[PDB]
């Protein structure tokens, strides 16, 4: 399977430089372009520049000709961009796309900001008599007090994802984000399954598996 | 740079409607025009291109047209899962351009919400916090009103909510609302209630409860 695999650090100073990658895999790296784009959330995407895995050329949009310098490394398969002097307006979802823009990665989030990274405490919503419906029971876990955003949160490793919401994060006063994210389960099989939310803030190298007991 | 006008920037449908939004090139793009859809959380997927080819997998629901400078794109038999965010691009000239975007959301009928209430965990209050969550979850329309009450008195400036985006599947929306307080003010207090009004409901529906266990 074609598969392109961006990553990066999230959280870095205004006045900074950083640098995103994108591991592509399953095909040719040398035998397709690579593009770049940039998305600020709720808007528009933008074409920042393209790079040859195979020669070096680069075509970049006027835009960020100065603002980003792509690179490739044909021994690891992966294509680098790396954005300086960095402003808020540079904090956004960066993408990297095949020539043919048919495939896409995930995208890396990159927030600037001169504020120290936090990492979230995981606390469980535990299923209780107050969380029950038609022979549902709701549970989750809240993530709070963290900064920046992203923080990545699934459900018994990715294999529980029905009945599923993550909620998009809230920004209290203190400046810091805190989200919750709920499963709704099966009240009769609560004795007999296990509940484990996985949570993920790379910039603070947070990495917590909290099981969600039911309340006793 | 030439840039493409697409319109409209919001559109309500519901399943099996017909749905159309178009893009206006500034200059010309003879037939170099391609149609993304961005489902939430999600990346950009190539839906057209050529202005009128469909991308491998893409369903015969999806549609392009236009020449020139007027594109369109058209879905027919609106499907729940084909809500999104479209953007068309331009790709004839450097450097690419993409339209504005247009956010496709689905009407459907209306749709209660199941309210559920989550007291703090034993670990937040040793942390010296405690932090109270009311569950709204899958109704239509997406507006509804939260109202915390703590011993029936009417709280206000200390919790925050966010809303779902539209669900894929049954369309619906779930909102989660945060009561947080010093684990002092919450021990201060017994009946911890989250009061919630939707159109689906009659009058308001409260869920509560004490500190037992």
């Known amino acids: 399977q074609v598969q392109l695999l961006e990553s990066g650090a999230e959280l870095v100073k205004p006045g900074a430089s950083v640098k995103l990658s994108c591991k592509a895999s399953?095909?040719?790296?040398?035998?397709?372009?690579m593009h770049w784009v940039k998305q600020r959330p709720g808007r528009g995407l933008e074409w920042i520049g393209m790079?040859?895995?195979?020669?070096?050329?680069?075509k970049y949009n006027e835009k960020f000709k100065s603002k980003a310098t792509l690179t490739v490394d044909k021994p690891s398969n992966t294509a680098y961009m790396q954005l300086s002097s960095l402003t808020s307006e540079d904090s956004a979802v960066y993408y990297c796309?095949?020539?043919?823009?048919?495939?896409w990665g995930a995208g890396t989030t990159v927030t600037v900001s001169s504020a120290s990274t936090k990492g979230p405490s995981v606390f469980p919503l535990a299923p209780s008599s107050k969380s029950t419906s038609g022979g549902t029971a709701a549970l989750g876990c809240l993530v709070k007090d963290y900064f920046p955003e992203p923080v990545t949160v699934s459900w018994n490793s990715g294999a529980l994802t029905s009945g599923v919401h993550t909620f998009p994060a809230v920004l209290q006063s203190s400046g810091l984000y805190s989200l919750s994210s709920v499963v709704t389960v099966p009240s009769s099989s609560l004795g007999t399954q296990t509940y484990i939310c996985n949570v993920n803030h790379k910039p603070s190298n947070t990495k917590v598996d909290k099981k969600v007991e039911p309340k006793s | 740079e030439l840039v493409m006008t697409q319109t409209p920037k919001f559109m309500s449908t519901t399943v099996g409607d017909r749905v159309s939004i178009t893009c206006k090139a500034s200059?010309?793009?003879?037939?170099?025009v391609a149609w993304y859809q961005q489902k939430p959380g999600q990346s950009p997927k190539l839906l057209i291109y050529?202005?009128?080819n469909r991308y491998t997998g893409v369903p015969d629901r999806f549609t392009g047209s236009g020449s020139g400078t007027d594109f369109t794109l058209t879905i027919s038999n609106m499907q729940s899962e084909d809500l999104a965010d479209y953007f068309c691009?331009?790709?004839?000239?450097?450097?690419?351009?993409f339209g504005g975007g247009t956010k496709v959301e689905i009407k459907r009928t209306v749709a209660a919400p199941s309210v559920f209430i989550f007291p703090p965990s034993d670990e937040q209050l040793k942390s010296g916090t405690a932090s109270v969550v009311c569950l709204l979850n899958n109704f239509y329309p997406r507006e509804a009103k939260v109202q915390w009450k703590v011993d029936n008195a009417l709280q206000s400036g200390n919790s925050q909510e966010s809303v779902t985006e539209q669900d894929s599947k049954d369309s619906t929306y779930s909102l989660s609302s945060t009561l947080t307080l010093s684990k002092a003010d919450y021990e201060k207090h017994k009946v911890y209630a989250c009061e919630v009004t939707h159109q689906g409901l009659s009058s308001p529906v409260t869920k509560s409860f004490n500190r037992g266990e």
């Open positions: 796309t095949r020539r043919d823009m048919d495939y």
């Open positions: 399953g095909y040719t790296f040398t035998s397709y372009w």
């Open positions: 790079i040859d895995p195979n020669s070096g050329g680069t």
């Open positions: 200059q010309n793009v003879g037939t170099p």
């Open positions: 050529s202005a009128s």
């Open positions: 691009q331009q790709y004839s000239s450097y450097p690419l351009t």
